[PDB]
Each structure stands twice: as structure tokens, then as C-alpha cells.
Amino acid sequence: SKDYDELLKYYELHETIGTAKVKLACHILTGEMVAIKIMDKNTLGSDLPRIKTEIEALKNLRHQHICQLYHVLETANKIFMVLEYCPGGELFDYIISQDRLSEEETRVVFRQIVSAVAYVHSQGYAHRDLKPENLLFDEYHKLKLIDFGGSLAYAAPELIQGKSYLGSEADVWSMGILLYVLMCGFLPFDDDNVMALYKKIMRGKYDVPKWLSPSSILLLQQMLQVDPKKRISMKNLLNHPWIMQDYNYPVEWQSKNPFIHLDDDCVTELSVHHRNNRQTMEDLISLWQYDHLTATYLLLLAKKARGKPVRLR
Numbered sequence: 574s575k576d577y578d579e580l581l582k583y584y585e586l587h588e589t590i591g592t593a594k595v596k597l598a599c600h601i602l603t604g605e606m607v608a609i610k611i612m613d614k615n616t617l618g619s620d621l622p623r624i625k626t627e628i629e630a631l632k633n634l635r636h637q638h639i640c641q642l643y644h645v646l647e648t649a650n651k652i653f654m655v656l657e658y659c660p661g662g663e664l665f666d667y668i669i670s671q672d673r674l675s676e677e678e679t680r681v682v683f684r685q686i687v688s689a690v691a692y693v694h695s696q697g698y699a700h701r702d703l704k705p706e707n708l709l710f711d712e713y714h715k716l717k718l719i720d721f722g723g724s725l726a727y728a729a730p731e732l733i734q735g736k737s738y739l740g741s742e743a744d745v746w747s748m749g750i751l752l753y754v755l756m757c758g759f760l761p762f763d764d765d766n767v768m769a770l771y772k773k774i775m776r777g778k779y780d781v782p783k784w785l786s787p788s789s790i791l792l793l794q795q796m797l798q799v800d801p802k803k804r805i806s807m808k809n810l811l812n813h814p815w816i817m818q819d820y821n822y823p824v825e826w827q828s829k830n831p832f833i834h835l836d837d838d839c840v841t842e843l844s845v846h847h848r849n850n851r852q853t854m855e856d857l858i859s860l861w862q863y864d865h866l867t868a869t870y871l872l873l874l875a876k877k878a879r880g881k882p883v884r885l886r
């Protein structure tokens with residue numbers, strides 16, 4: 574209860590959804606809805622440093638298809654992460670509701686995944702846990718990547734043997750597994766016992782449904798090469814013929830949300846509320862401490878992108 578004291582001054586809490594717990598909230602000063610992920614420091618033990626270093630990851634990824642981090646609030650025995658409002662549901666449950674998605678809907682949707690994952694690689698990171706439960710929809714049915722971090726059915730085989738791997742190629746395999754699920758509705762390698770499933774991933778043999786097209790079957794063979802050297806590269810995947818079917822342009826992966834230059838109207842509005850001059854506030858925003866100022870600036874930034882006035886209530 575005391576852990577929420579410092580936080581309830583910045584947000585008003587609403588529903589509860591995911592099970593670490595996630596509760597919907599409203600940031601007071603901007604009126605923008607958010608999602609707050611609540612982790613408990615005493616349960617996870619001391620594997621928070623892997624989560625802390627993944628929180629420092631999200632602090633360095635900003636992308637139209639990455640769920641934005643707004644605010645990290647650390648208390649005595651809880652850690653709070655304030656994130657982007659994604660009300661369109663989860664990609665996993667959506668695939669199950671339609672059984673399978675069309676080749677053209679998956680293509681539209683797979684292109685946002687490649688855009689997200691390509692961007693995180695350009696920054697020197699790798700998601701390493703690509704699966705449909707780690708992809709959210711917003712109101713526009715746009716995809717938002719979450720949970721940077723054992724999920725066996727999506728792990729690359731060199732990750733399986735415990736050998737030395739490149740983070741990028743492991744994601745490429747995971748995207749290949751995930752592309753399969755998008756168009757089929759079931760895993761390419763699946764089994765009740767792990768030892769059989771463990772073995773099936775390294776054999777590389779999957780059954781191909783009759784409904785997957787010739788343009789579809791060979792991209793899966795390119796993405797799910799067991800040997801990483803033969804796996805398709807992100808560069809060649811950004812303009813793959815299948816990726817450019819239906820929409821003939823290479824995937825736009827470069828982010829439209831940098832750190833370097835701050836928004837003027839956002840900064841001026843933050844200055845009149847905090848009663849500071851401009852450069853002083855820019856210096857405090859440039860620190861990017863992911864306190865309440867970073868959250869206010871980021872949510873005030875999003876507020877303008879919508880079309881609302883850049884004003885703090």
C-alpha cells in the first residue's frame with residue numbers, strides 16, 4: 574500500500590488485465606490513458622538485473638511498432654512500468670478467434686513485425702522472445718512489440734543446443750515460426766513431451782498445409798533454416814518478394830520517434846506549467862531519467878500526434 578503512495582500522485586488506477594500484473598490508469602496532468610505493469614521485487618528473487626537491463630533496453634527503443642515505455646517508478650518492494658495504451662487486444666487471441674488469417678492480412682501484419690524487429694537490431698539489440706503473446710494491437714489494429722527478455726516452440730535450434738548464436742538470426746527464426754502460426758493457426762513444431770518437440774525443432778521438418786501459396790512456402794524455408802548461416806538476413810527480408818507482394822515497397826523500419834530533438838510545443842507547455850525557462854527544461858528533459866517528467870513529455874508528445882491541444886490540466 575505504501576508502495577503506491579508515490580505513484581498515485583501521478584496516475585489514477587482502473588481495471589486489471591494481465592497475469593506480473595497490469596492495471597489500466599490515467600495520467601493526471603495529460604488525461605492520457607496508459608498501462609502500468611507491476612512487478613513485485615520479492616517474488617522474482619535476484620533475476621531483476623536481467624529485467625532491469627531489459628528495462629534499460631526499452632529506454633533505448635522507440636518505434637511506431639514497439640510498445641513505448643513512459644515511466645519507471647521503483648519503490649521498496651515493487652517496480653512500476655508505465656507503458657503505451659494498447660486496447661486492440663493481443664495478437665495471439667486474435668489468431669485463435671479467426672482460426673487462421675488470410676495471406677494478405679498476415680502480410681500486412683508481418684510487415685509491422687519486421688519493421689519493429691529490424692529497428693531493434695539497428696540499435697544493437699535482439700528481442701530473443703518473439704511470439705504472438707508478445708505482440709499487442711492498439712486501437713488502429715497496429716502491432717506493438719512487448720516483453721523484452723522459457724518459451725520452447727519459438728526458440729531457434731542453435732539456441733536449443735545451447736550453442737553460440739547471433740541474436741538477430743534467432744529472432745529471424747522466431748519470426749519464421751510466428752509467420753507459420755499467422756497463416757496456419759498452429760505451431761510448425763509441436764509436441765506434448767519436450768524431448769520430442771526438442772528433437773523436432775532441430776530436425777527442421779514441418780508439415781505444410783495445402784492452403785499456403787508458392788510465394789509463402791519458400792519464405793518459410795528461408796526463415797526456418799536450421800543452420801543460421803543459411804537463414805535469411807534481415808536486409809534481404811526487408812525487400813523480400815513475399816514481403817513486397819500486395820504492397821510493393823520495402824519495409825519502412827527506421828523509427829519516426831527519436832530522442833535527440835525535443836518537440837517545441839511540448840517543451841514550451843512544460844515550461845509554463847513548471848514555470849521554468851526553455852533551455853532549463855530541455856536540459857532536464859534531455860536527461861531522460863524516465864521519472865515523471867519523461868512520462869509527461871512523452872505523453873504530451875503523443876497527445877499532440879493525436880491532435881489534442883498540448884496542455885496540462
Ligand SMILES: COc1cc(-c2cn[nH]c2)ccc1C(=O)Nc1ccc2c(c1)CC[NH2+]CC2
Nearest residue numbers: 590591595608640656657658659660662719720
Ligand atoms: C495486457 O495489457 C497491456 C500490456 C502491455 C504491456 C505488457 N508488457 N509491455 C507492455 C501494454 C498495454 C496493455 C493494454 O493496453 N492493455 C489492454 C489490453 C486489452 C484491452 C485494454 C487494455 C482496454 C480495456 N478493454 C479490453 C481490451
